[PDB]
Tab-separated table of C-alpha atoms and ligand atoms in Angstrom:
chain	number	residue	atom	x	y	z
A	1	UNK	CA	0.000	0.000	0.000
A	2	UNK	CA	2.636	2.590	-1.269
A	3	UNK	CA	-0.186	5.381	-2.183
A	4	UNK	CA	-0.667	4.000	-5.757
A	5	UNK	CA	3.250	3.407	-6.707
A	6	UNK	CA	4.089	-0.018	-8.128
A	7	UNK	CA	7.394	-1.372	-6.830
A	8	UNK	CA	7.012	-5.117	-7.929
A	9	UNK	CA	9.593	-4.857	-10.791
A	10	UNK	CA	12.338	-3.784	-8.819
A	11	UNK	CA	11.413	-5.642	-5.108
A	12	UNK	CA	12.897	-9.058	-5.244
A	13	UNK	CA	10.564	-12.291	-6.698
A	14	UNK	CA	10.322	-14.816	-4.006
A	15	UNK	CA	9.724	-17.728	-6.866
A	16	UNK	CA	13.654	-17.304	-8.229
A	17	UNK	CA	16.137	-19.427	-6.477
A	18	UNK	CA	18.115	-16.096	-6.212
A	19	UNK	CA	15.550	-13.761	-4.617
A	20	UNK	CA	16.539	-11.019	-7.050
A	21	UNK	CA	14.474	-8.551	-8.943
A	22	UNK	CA	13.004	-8.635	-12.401
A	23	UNK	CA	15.141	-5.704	-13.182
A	24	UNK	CA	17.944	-7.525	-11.976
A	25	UNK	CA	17.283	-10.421	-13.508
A	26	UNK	CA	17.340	-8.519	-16.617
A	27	UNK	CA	20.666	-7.161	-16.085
A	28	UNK	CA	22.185	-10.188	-15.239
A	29	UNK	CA	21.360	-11.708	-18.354
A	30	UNK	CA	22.537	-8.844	-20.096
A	31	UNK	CA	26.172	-9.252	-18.836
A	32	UNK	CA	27.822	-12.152	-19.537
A	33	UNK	CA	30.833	-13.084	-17.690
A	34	UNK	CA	33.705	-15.712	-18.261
A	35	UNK	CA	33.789	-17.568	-14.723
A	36	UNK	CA	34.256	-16.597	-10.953
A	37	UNK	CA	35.848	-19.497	-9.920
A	38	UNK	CA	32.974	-21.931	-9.607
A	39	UNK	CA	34.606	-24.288	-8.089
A	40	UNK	CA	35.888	-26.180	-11.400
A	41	UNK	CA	36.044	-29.755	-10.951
A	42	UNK	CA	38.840	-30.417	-13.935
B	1	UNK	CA	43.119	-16.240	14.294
B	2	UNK	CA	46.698	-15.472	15.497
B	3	UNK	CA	49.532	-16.898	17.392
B	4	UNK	CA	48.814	-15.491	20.738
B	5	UNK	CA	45.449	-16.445	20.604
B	6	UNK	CA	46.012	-20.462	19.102
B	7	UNK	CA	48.207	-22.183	17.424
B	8	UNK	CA	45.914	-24.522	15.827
B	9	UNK	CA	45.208	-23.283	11.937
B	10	UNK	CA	43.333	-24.692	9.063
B	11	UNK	CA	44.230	-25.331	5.805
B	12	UNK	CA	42.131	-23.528	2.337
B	13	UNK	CA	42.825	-25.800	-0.869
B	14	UNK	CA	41.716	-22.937	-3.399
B	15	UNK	CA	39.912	-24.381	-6.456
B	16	UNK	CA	40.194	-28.270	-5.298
B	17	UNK	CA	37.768	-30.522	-5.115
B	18	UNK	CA	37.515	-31.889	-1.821
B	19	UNK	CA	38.338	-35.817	-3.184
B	20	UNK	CA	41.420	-34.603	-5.176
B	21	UNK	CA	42.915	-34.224	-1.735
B	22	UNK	CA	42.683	-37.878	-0.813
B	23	UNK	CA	43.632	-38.286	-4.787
B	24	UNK	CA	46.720	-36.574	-3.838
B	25	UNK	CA	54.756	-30.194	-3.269
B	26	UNK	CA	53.815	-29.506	0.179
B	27	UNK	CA	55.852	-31.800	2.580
B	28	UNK	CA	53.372	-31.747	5.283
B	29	UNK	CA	50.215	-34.782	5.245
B	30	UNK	CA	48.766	-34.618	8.355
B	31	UNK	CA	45.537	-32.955	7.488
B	32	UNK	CA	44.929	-35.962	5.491
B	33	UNK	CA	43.208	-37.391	8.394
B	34	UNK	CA	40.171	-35.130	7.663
B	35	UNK	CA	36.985	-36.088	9.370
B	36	UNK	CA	35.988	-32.139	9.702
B	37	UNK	CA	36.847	-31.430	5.738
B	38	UNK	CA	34.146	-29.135	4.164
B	39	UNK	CA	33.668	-28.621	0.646
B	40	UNK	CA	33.301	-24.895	-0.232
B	41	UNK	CA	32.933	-22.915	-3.372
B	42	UNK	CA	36.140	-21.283	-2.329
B	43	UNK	CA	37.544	-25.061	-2.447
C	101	LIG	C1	2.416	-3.699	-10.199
C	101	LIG	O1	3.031	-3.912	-11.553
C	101	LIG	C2	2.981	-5.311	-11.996
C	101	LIG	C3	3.475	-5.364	-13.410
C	101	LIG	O2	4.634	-4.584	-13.529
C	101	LIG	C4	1.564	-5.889	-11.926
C	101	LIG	O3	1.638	-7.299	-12.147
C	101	LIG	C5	0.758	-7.657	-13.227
C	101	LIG	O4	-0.649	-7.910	-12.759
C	101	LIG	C6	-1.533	-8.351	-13.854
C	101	LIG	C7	-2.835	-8.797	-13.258
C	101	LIG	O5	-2.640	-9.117	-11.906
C	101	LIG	C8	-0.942	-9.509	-14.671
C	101	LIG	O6	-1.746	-9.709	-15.836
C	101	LIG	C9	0.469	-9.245	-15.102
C	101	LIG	O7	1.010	-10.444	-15.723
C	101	LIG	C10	1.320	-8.876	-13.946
C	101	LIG	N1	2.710	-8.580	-14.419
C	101	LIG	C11	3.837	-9.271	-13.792
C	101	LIG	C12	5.271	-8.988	-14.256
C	101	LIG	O8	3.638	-10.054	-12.920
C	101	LIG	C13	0.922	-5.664	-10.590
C	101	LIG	O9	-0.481	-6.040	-10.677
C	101	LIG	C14	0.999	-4.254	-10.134
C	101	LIG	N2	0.536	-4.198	-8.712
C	101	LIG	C15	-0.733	-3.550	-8.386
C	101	LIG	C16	-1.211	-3.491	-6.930
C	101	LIG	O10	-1.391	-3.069	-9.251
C	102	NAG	C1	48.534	-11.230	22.067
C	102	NAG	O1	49.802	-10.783	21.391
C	102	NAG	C2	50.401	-9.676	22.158
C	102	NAG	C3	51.688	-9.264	21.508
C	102	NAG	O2	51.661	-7.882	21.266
C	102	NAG	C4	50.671	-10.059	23.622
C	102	NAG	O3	51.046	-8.881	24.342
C	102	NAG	C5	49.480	-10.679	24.299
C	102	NAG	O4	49.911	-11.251	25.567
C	102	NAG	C6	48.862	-11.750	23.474
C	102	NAG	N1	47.644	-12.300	24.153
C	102	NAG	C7	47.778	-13.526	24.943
C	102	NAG	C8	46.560	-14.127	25.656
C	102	NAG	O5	48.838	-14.058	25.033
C	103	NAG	C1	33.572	-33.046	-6.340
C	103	NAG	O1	33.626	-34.535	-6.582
C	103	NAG	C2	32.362	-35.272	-6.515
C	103	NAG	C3	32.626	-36.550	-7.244
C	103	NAG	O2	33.983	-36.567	-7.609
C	103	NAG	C4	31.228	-34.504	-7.193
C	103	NAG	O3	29.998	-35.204	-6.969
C	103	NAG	C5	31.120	-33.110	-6.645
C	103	NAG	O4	29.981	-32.432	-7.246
C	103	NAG	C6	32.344	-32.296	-6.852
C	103	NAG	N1	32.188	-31.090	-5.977
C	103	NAG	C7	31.701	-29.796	-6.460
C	103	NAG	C8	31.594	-28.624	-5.478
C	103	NAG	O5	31.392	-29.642	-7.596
């Protein structure tokens, strides 16, 4: 109840695994990255 | 967490899966008892 303003699209989205926005979301499919260390397994 | 403090330490493997440890420069083996080894995404 934010007086009319509509905050879903940058709050974060309980559904995702990774409780990010869908703005977020957006930009992290817009940058791609070549690994963090991820643990490789060889 | 310091000298003065302990001198008990533990050891980071960066980048290693846990296993590779019992699969295996470092003179020193006796960590390789384990029982307490944790598997992070750090290694
Ligand atoms: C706030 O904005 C979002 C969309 O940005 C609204 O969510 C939509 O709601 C309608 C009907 O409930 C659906 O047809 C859309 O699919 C929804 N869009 C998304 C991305 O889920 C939301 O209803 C708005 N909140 C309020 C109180 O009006
Ligand atoms: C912590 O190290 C300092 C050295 O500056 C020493 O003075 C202090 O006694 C040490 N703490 C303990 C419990 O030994
Ligand atoms: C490490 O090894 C086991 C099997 O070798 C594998 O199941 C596991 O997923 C690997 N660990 C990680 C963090 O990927």
């Amino acid at each position: 109840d934010f007086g009319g303003f509509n905050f879903s699209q940058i709050l974060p989205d309980p559904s995702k695994p990774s409780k990010r926005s869908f703005i977020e979301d957006l930009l992290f499919n817009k940058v791609t990255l070549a690994d963090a260390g991820f643990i490789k397994q060889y | 967490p310091g000298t003065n403090t302990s001198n008990q330490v533990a050891v980071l493997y960066q980048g290693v899966n846990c296993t590779e440890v019992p699969v295996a420069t470092p003179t020193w083996r006796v960590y390789s008892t384990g029982s307490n080894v944790f598997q992070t995404r750090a290694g």
